[PDB]
């Protein structure tokens, strides 16, 4: 196969990284592994270090003249690449050994473990009203050579590379997502009973969703309109709990449910980005540099609920709103996930 590479502007420092996309198995994540190439006489007294910093970065990095990132650091780690340290953790890996064989003596192994309590690559969509890129949690691997950890940063020394942490669907489907609502009235014994059921609890992007909705209007009021929409909730946690809920796809039908009657139907709704290019606050999956992508992949939580809230959390929900005449509006809400399948 191949190995992605990045080199310092000076050309004396180069870092080889085994992979660009890292995945988790809900119990352990594939370790970050790579090698760094450098010729010893360039430093001859300095030391080589690598850093994996995850930041709540705002804006962009192309020297934009605007209020730049609130650069809250979520989690940072360090490792002495050179001079060599004790062998752990634990040996050089198969890719590490292969790169050492390919290059020789000027390669240096560095290892990293991503804690399970970390967010997933998410990026908010930049609004046309503002300028440049927008905020969003992101990973970054930075290898620098210097005498001390706190020594001043140098462009020729530091090399910057971006990685992503994304999740993949478990092969075990979950319970059927369904809900019900029985709405009585202020005094009358007549009521309003409705049913909602879903095809599945897991879906792939672009794949249409068929909601099964049924109404039992054994009452006297009139149903004017039926509103069907899919809502997105984005739990943002920096030091305070917050969420910017926003709809993404809405479909309507001018269907009238008569009193003392029952009505059921199947509706098709699809979450897609083509019609929501401008809505600020939409959540997109992590980009490499600036390339487009799908909507934000739903992030499943671990079995142990712990806290797990140290970044951006995204979830999807579908709500169907029944417009009943002269008041009594009632809606039904239901959760589901939406994210990629397991590749090969």
């Amino acid at each position: 196969t191949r190995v992605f590479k990045k080199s310092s502007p000076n050309g004396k420092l180069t870092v080889y990284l085994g992979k660009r996309d890292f995945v988790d198995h809900l119990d352990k994540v594939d370790p970050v592994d790579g090698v760094v190439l450098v010729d010893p006489d360039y430093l001859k007294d300095r030391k080589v270090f690598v850093t994996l910093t995850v930041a709540f970065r705002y804006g962009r990095e192309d020297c934009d003249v605007l209020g730049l990132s609130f650069r809250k650091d979520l989690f940072i780690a360090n490792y002495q690449a050179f001079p060599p340290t004790p062998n752990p953790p634990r040996p050089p890996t198969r890719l590490q050994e292969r790169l050492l064989r390919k290059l020789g003596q000027h390669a240096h192994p560095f290892f990293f473990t991503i804690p399970q309590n970390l967010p997933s690559s998410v990026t908010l969509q930049p609004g046309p009203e503002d300028t440049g890129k927008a905020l969003g949690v992101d990973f970054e691997i930075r290898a620098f050579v210097a005498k001390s950890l706190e020594e001043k940063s140098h462009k020729r020394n530091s090399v910057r590379l971006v990685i992503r942490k994304v999740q993949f669907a478990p092969e075990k489907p979950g319970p059927q997502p369904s809900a019900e609502t029985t709405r009585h009235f202020l005094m009358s014994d007549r009521s309003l009973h409705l049913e909602a059921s879903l095809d599945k609890e897991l879906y792939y992007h672009g794949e249409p969703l068929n909601v099964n909705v049924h109404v039992t209007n054994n009452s006297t009021k009139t149903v004017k309109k039926i509103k069907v929409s899919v809502r997105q909730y984005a739990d943002i946690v920096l030091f305070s709990t917050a969420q910017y809920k926003v709809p993404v796809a809405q479909v309507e039908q001018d269907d009238q449910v008569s009193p003392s009657s029952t009505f059921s139907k199947v509706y098709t709704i699809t979450p897609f980005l083509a019609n929501n290019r401008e809505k600020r606050g939409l959540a997109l999956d992590g980009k490499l540099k600036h390339e487009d992508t799908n909507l934000a992949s739903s992030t499943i939580v671990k079995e142990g609920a712990n806290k797990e809230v140290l970044g951006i959390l995204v979830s999807y929900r579908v709500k169907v709103k029944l417009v009943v005449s002269r008041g009594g509006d009632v809606s039904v809400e239901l959760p589901f996930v939406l994210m990629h399948p397991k590749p090969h």
Partner: peptide, 10 residues
């Protein structure tokens, strides 16, 4: 820039 290199099959 980001590029690729070689790697050999062991």
């Amino acid at each position: 820039t980001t590029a690729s290199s070689s790697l050999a099959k062991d």
